[PDB]
Design a binder for this molecule. Sequence first.
Ligand SMILES: CCC[C@@H](C)[C@H]1CC[C@H]2[C@@H]3[C@H](O)C[C@@H]4C[C@H](O)CC[C@]4(C)[C@H]3C[C@H](O)[C@]12C
Ligand SMILES: CCC[C@@H](C)[C@H]1CC[C@H]2[C@@H]3[C@H](O)C[C@@H]4C[C@H](O)CC[C@]4(C)[C@H]3C[C@H](O)[C@]12C
Ligand SMILES: [Mg+2]
Ligand SMILES: [Zn+2]
Ligand SMILES: [Zn+2]
Lengths: 551, 46, 1338
Amino acid sequence: SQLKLLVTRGKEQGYLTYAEVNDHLPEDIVDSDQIEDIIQMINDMGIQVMEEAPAENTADEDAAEAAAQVLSSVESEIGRTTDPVRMYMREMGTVELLTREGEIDIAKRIEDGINQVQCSVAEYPEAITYLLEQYDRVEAEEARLSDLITGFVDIDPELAREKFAELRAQYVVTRDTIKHATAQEEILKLSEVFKQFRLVPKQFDYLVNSMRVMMDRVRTQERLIMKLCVEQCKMPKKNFITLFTGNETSDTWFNAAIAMNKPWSEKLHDVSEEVHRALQKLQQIEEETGLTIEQVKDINRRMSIGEAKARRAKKEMVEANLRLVISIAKKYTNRGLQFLDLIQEGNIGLMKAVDKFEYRRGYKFSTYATWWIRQAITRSIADQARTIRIPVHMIETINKLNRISRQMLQEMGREPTPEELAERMLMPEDKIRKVLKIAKEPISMETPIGDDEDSHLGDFIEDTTLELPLDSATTESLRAATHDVLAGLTAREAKVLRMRFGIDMNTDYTLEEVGKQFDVTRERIRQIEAKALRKLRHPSRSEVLRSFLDD
Amino acid sequence: RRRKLPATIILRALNYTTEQILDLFFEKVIFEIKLQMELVPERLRG
Amino acid sequence: EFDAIKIALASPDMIRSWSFGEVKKPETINYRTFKPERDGLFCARIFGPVKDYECLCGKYKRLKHRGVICEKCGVEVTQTKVRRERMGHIELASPTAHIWFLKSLPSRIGLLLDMPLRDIERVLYFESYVVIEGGMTNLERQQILTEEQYLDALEEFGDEFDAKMGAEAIQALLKSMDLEQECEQLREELNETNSETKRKKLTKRIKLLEAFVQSGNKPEWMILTVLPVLPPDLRPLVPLDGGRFATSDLNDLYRRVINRNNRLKRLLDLAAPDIIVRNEKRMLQEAVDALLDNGRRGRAITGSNKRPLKSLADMIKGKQGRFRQNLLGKRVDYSGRSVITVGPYLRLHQCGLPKKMALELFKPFIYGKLELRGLATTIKAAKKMVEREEAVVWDILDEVIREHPVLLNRAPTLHRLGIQAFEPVLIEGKAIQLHPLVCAAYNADFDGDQMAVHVPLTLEAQLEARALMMSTNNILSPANGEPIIVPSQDVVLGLYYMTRDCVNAKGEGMVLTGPKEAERLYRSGLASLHARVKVRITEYEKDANGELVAKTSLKDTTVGRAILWMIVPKGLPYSIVNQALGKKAISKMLNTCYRILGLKPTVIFADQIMYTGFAYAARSGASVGIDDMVIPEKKHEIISEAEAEVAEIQEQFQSGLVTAGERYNKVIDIWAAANDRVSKAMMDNLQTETVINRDGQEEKQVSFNSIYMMADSGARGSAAQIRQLAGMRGLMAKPDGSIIETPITANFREGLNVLQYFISTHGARKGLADTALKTANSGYLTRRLVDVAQDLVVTEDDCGTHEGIMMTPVIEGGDVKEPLRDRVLGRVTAEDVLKPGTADILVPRNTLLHEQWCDLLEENSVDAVKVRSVVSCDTDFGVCAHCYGRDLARGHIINKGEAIGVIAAQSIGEPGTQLTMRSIQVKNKGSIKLSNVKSVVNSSGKLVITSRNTELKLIDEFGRTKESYKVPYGAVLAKGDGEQVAGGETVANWDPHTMPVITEVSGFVRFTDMIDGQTITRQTDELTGLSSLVVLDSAERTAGGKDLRPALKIVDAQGNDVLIPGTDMPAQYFLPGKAIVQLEDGVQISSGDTLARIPQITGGLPRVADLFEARRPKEPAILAEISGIVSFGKETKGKRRLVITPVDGSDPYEEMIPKWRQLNVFEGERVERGDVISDGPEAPHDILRLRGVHAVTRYIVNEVQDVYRLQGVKINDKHIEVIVRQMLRKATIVNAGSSDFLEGEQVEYSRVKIANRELEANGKVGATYSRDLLGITKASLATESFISAASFQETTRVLTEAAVAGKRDELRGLKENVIVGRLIPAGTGYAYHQDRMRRRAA
Ligand SMILES: CCC[C@@H](C)[C@H]1CC[C@H]2[C@@H]3[C@H](O)C[C@@H]4C[C@H](O)CC[C@]4(C)[C@H]3C[C@H](O)[C@]12C
Ligand SMILES: CCC[C@@H](C)[C@H]1CC[C@H]2[C@@H]3[C@H](O)C[C@@H]4C[C@H](O)CC[C@]4(C)[C@H]3C[C@H](O)[C@]12C
Ligand SMILES: [Mg+2]
Ligand SMILES: [Zn+2]
Ligand SMILES: [Zn+2]
């Protein structure tokens, strides 16, 4: 319609004026870039913007028809945006802010989730043996006492050692008392006394990961059995639910299920070996677990639920905190890094805050974050803003000098001198000159340096690693002359010289191997080489080789 | 150099009413009610 | 080595196959040890060593270790130039779409998915979801779902639901697709979808799918998963002086991509909220698209400056890209430039070269020749000897230069004579000396111009310089066979002065024994150079089979002519030097020598002419003074008279008796007449003198005034410039294009006052500003014409065709402006030229018409010869030598391997900065002849024109036309066919207005349906009251009469209705609207009586450009789309309707003739296809369709030669037909026949032509077609090579189209072998390519 009217003239004249296009342009508000998009869309069939009123047609109809169809779509469009920052503001402008009480609920949800996870990992106490072994090795002076554990939930090493002694006593009195009615109570008491301790995040995560590896091994075995008993044998799931579940340890559910007088039971004969190996691995692991796998399964389910609750909790905290970072980031727009990059770097510092924030101390987040965010923006501007990376320390020093220099200029009405800068700062003066040399950003090799031929700066930079052609001809001339002066000699001495220096060969053989082939003991071959040299030395055999002696 | 819009918009943006716009731009022909009109000899040039 | 270049999409496996390692860090080099970092963009363990044969740690430093990987760093020890070839790769964290295949206007991804671009972009930028094989749960594949819709649909659908977002969704769509099944479905649909738009879309899509299937690609390769990384040495980080570094913009883009990819990978492992990961993926997409093609969809990306960064696409495309600049326009060794001086002592094959410039250009030759003679023991010794400039070095240099041509070239190479080969002559100084006779070829003068000199190195290059490019081989213009080595300005003045008589000079009436005695008398002072004497002259003539028979006689001539006769070679006559010998006489003399004697005599003769002219121009002592500019004695009287006349006109205007518009023209004409009078008086007072005498009586003779001598001889200047020197400056113009009424009445011998000078300044600056535009516009046309015609080559000896054009002289109304000789010389006859008596064959056939044959044709006075043309050659992919003609630069039939397209383009283009964008009265005596003439005896027995194509030609006594006048319809001719006429004998007259309506027989007329007040109006003359019934148009007449058609059928006195005399149909002559029926209603009339009386190009270079670009005229003349009887039907329907019901054929053809048009055909008339209905500018496309190919070529050559002829330019018609041959080279198929082509399809004419010829030899039938006419731009666009096309078209469009099609290029054009750096298949390299093709067929 309106666009079609604009096309009408375009073609009728073969050209149009910026004003007429902008006016006929659909009222459809366009965010500049959109207007930019359509201008080329019109340029697709070919048109002259010409801010003023006015050279041949070379446009394929296929391009033309496609541009026409997309042009029609532009009118039917509503809010098409080809700009990432704008899209980001919109997708972010869809989450409400949180009030002061709005972090307490989230924080307690996080604390409850992590407490559930801690108890669930606590229920599986087999790790306690690993913790005890680590403590024993540490007490063997393999590591620091305070590095293994960040204290306990109590403040002195003697108390920690007493608690470790009690833990070991309970472990030994519970492990050796399985014989079952009361063993569960002993295990519960052991877990409860272990709950009073506090572990470093790295060791706790390692224990969790080891447990996950064991559980994934068990799950791999179970799924291998399932695929070897269902896909190959079409074993009804009802049989698996009835037999495998309930015991989960013996071979009765599989080995003794072969006599069920069913086709799948008979077909299990072919795959009995691999499933039997899987059962053997499980029996061992089931013994290693020493706990009903179903109970473990429920432990993992509860842990997953707690982790999901914690993750979605912070999610909302970080959505309001994305609402932020946009402010701090705008403070470094022209610092050598692009805005969306600054914002995304801040979002990571924000995540780091939310996970390390304690509401008990009642800090305004908007303050336990406005730092973590700026630290992450500046760290980035320092580690990936220059093509030639500079250490954070050198960047700090350079910024300090650029400041101390501004003040000295304002109070001296004159740029300071490498000497006065050294005096005002605390640097050996030569260090100042070194830091005042760290070349600024590389120049663009396409920088226009023209007005005659439209030539760029990179066109005038020469290649310095090239051999001149009179040096390649000179080299071949020596490679020949040498053959003459040398050939003008007897065979054995010529080969001695050839081997010693490497003429026509692939190694500068030392005297030992030359003697091996020529049978001798160095001193003679040394003798043969020296005669040759003094010989080729006299005039009448070394005039052209002399010429090759630059002088 | 933006999109053009009708001129009168700006006048309305300057706190002008339609009556004032017409008073500024156009002259006035009066009519009386029988059905008599005042005539100015110069107006009916042709 | 290689014989083709294949192009296709790259699989991720292939991209990993190219790479030597993965780049993982955005690092480039260390900031203190400036060494490459471990896994960065300038690494050494991925891209190779930074020093030849050395590791980076330094353990392995000697070549003896070449080929091992040091374990302290893994840097293979090899050559550092391997760093210029090795690629890396980057593993993207998320698939990314290639911008070229996503945002090319046809949008290959969208075309292949049948999905609009907006949906693809929305899914791409995480705006909405999509369905990838939704399955059997009410889902539709490729269905767009917004986020909330996806959420709510996920509910109650426990199935996977196969929905995704982002470039991975697009990749899944492409991967799950099957092309063969789509082809099957499309065929099934095309079986029963016979609807225009629908079947068109189905055919388009099945074509695209079949092409993609054949290409061998997979669609999922359009989505990037691995990103290649360019070798470091093509994007270097070079250190500069002062510690500064220079870097390529690609390093910034690569660092951006790597930073965002690493951030995305790190952010995926932190399980961040999906908003963050979506934004990171969008950023990664943006960074990759900026790398591949910056600012194609976004706005841009800028570096430290505000300039946009240069991307990979920006390094191939543009006017600076590799596919352009470097590859045909690079810097060259063994070359140098300098300033040019005259050097009048040189021979045409020799140039003066500075000794110092030659000691540098020929340095390696000097080293070699020194070492070969023992002067220097080694090459370093030789380098020091030449450096010291020893004495022996100059002798060795003189030996090296002896026979070794050098190519000289002047700035704008506009034609091939801008590079020529010369033998050097070592000279002192620093300026090149250039033979004067060559200047015209270079368009060079000696006021600061410079020339470049190149030296051929190989043996073949030297031989080509000596045999092809030498200046003594190129003395004829390739545009026209005329010599281009004619003496220019001072030679002309000297030779004109020498051969120039005067009334009474020393030694008049003497009798000499020969030229030698004449020269002996002049140098001894005993005779004047202008002394009418009698001399015994001996002249030889080849009046035999090459015998040179001698004749001695006693000629009457001056001393100077006899002296000049000494340099003329034997075979020429004596009348050539027995005239005043101006500028054109000398060119005629050189042409005669060339055509009679050959090439070597012509070269010797031209040098002798130059020497003699220079000598005697010095001798004359000609000069220019102020008294030489003689102002007329009556100038002021003429000016006063004109001023009085203009004053009288002005005072009358002030009295209101003349309008201002008319008085303006009156004053303009008065001043033009005054200017003409002044010029005539000046030129008559200047061009003659009085001299006394042999006896003592007055006698007039041609003046020896220096200015008139320069102007008359053609040496320099013209009467127009002498007019501004001695007459009046004349009439100026205005910035508006108007002519200022008052002229500048002063000349330059006087002075201009300040006002007149201020007026003159405007014209000067206007001209200065124009010249530049003309230059820029002539370059455009030449580039476009070589792009179209570059690969046309003579590839055969004789195609054996029997068709050709019919050459006859071109006559525009009056005299003939181009005889038959110019148009037919050098061509080959297609048919025997029968003697005008029809007796026997004059030239049998296949005879190259050289000068002797053309003289014979002039003797027999035949003016119609059929000649073979390029545009109608049967050769496939080329042209034969017989259909071309002869070379025009060599003078003989053309040779196989000749780039006739480049020659044609350059010949048309070079003369274009010299082109500026601007009743019958039988004059002679002859027997008038008429053509296509229908007529009937009038009342006085005079003839009446009853034909729309009537032609009158003043056939002369011999039967050769000398005038051709189109005879207006409805007019009467006094004389008749065979009736001899005379001067001013207006053969006929006709109304300058109002097309008359004539009948055929004398009889009464009934105004049937001609009702007054209904169909017509009683407009009887108001004053004379004479019946003037006027037909009323549909709206003009009553609605009832509107349907009624006004008719005036003839009726006999018997009361019967007369039938058109000689026809059964009654003599009804329906009159259209406005028809002036001054005749009374129902009135008897005479035979062919006036039944009624219906009421009544750019120029210059833009005219030529739009003539080759086949542009349709704005008011296209309408023609007879078919032969038959004209008529009409549903009128007023916005456009009147017409029909030509074929006499026997059906389909009367209906047309929407716009009513505002003025038809030329009576509603009842018969016509033939290609007959004017309306009238105006003809359209080339109509002419090709209605009339044959020979009738559109004749139109273009004649239409484009008018622009050139008007300006005095002369170029042969061969060159315009080779361009036209390239315009109509595509054919549209009409009936598929028994061939394998669809009907509505365009194919190469040379392809359909051979497909059915081979089919016809078999037991099948051919496919019919209709030829197409294209402009030089679209015709070019159709090249079958993506390398040649990528040079002068849009590189991005060419490479995306070729990659998806899996195209392959086999180098056989001239532009693709230049880029790849191998012999072009045209000239000396035409034999190489032929043997290559032989071996390949093997
Ligand atoms: C105006 C034309 C552009 C070109 C002539 C100008 C524009 C920017 C200039 C360079 C930059 O300043 C950076 C360096 C500064 C050093 O001091 C001298 C070298 C250095 C490359 C400069 C040389 C030159 O002057 C440049 C290329
Ligand atoms: C008309 C534009 C001026 C241009 C020709 C001048 C202005 C600055 C000059 C360059 C700079 O010095 C930086 C480099 C210094 C190296 O030593 C030699 C190369 C290098 C590019 C110089 C060559 C040349 O001299 C430049 C480009
Ligand atoms: Mg000049
Ligand atoms: Zn190493
Ligand atoms: Zn031919």
